[PDB]
């Protein structure tokens, strides 16, 4: 039997509608933007490490894009400090990241995978800590939103 | 022994026939009479069946519109829509 | 002096 | 990964690039008679065998 194949961060890698909420006077606010479901992508680096992987909103919430730090055994991914943004001059910060096998239900019923991270923005002049937390793209328009 | 044999079904589509027009407009007050409608399933009548999805509040002059759906036993969807406008007086 | 391909749907 | 093009799903591709198989029930190929196959989106793997 053929081993496909991979690279080196493929398990966390991949297409998502996530949604944003934020965590306001200690309470979480679900989606306060009015964002609805958005796409965003995560991907290996060119360096294919197992060590750090990308994250891109796809410019569909902040416009944003970094390398955050990768723990594939654990399936999780989280900055140190503030990070150059590559998208548009900016810095973010990914805390309490990860990625969970299966864990997810779509809105056709079928499991998938929840990810779900903690961000801020250093031009957030609100100083606000945001929650997204999706599920892998199936591909099924009605799974789509 | 062959292993793959096709496993489909043939699910049969509904067709689902509006009955009188697109747009109706009513005076306020004047209540909301249902043209009614038709839909098939495989030559079955399951016109029984079409739920409508909004309401036309006959008091609030507005645009009121109204969705017509009907599924097949698969669950598979057809559906129109009629809009209704209550002018005051 | 050569043959073409054609290329597929999808 | 089933029927499908760019990923998502299609009922009539000629190739397999679609979503991964959810065991789901979805429709293929073309309608007839206002009719149309629904299968299990499950591989095969002998189909051509």
């Known amino acids: ?145 | 022994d062959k292993s793959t044999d096709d496993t489909s079904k043939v699910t049969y589509f509904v067709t689902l026939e509006r009955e009188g027009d697109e747009k109706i407009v009513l005076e306020k007050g004047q209540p909301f009479v249902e043209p009614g409608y038709y839909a098939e399933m495989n030559g079955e009548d399951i016109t029984e069946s079409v739920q409508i999805k909004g309401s036309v509040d006959v008091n609030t002059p507005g645009i009121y519109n109204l969705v017509y759906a009907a599924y097949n036993e698969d669950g598979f969807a057809k559906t129109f829509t009629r809009t209704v406008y209550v002018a005051d007086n | 002096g050569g043959g073409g391909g054609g290329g597929g749907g999808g | 990964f089933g029927m499908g093009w760019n990923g998502n799903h299609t009922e009539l591709e000629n190739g397999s690039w679609g979503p991964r198989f959810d065991g789901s029930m979805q429709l293929w190929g073309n309608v007839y008679n206002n009719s149309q196959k629904l299968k299990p989106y499950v591989a095969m793997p002998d189909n051509i065998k």
């Not at chain 1, 039997?1 to 996530?18: I, L, Q, R, S, Y």
């Not at chain 1, 055994?73 to 998208?87: E, H, L, M």
């Not at chain 1, 910060?93 to 903690?118: F, N, Q």
């Open chain 1, 1 to 145: 039997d053929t081993e496909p194949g991979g690279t080196a961060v493929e398990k966390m890698a991949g297409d998502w509608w996530v949604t944003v909420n934020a965590f306001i006077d200690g309470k979480e606010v679900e989606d306060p933007f009015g964002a609805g479901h958005l796409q965003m992508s995560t991907y290996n680096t060119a360096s294919n490490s197992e060590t750090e992987m990308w994250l891109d909103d796809l410019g569909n919430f902040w416009e944003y894009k970094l390398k955050v730090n990768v723990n594939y055994a654990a399936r999780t991914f989280s900055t140190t400090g503030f990070v150059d943004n590559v998208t548009y001059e900016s810095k973010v910060k990914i805390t309490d990241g990860k990625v969970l096998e299966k864990a997810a239900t779509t809105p056709s019923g079928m499991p998938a995978d929840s990810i779900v991270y903690m961000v801020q923005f250093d031009d957030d002049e609100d100083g606000l800590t945001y929650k997204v937390s999706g599920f892998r793209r199936t591909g099924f328009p009605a799974d789509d939103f």
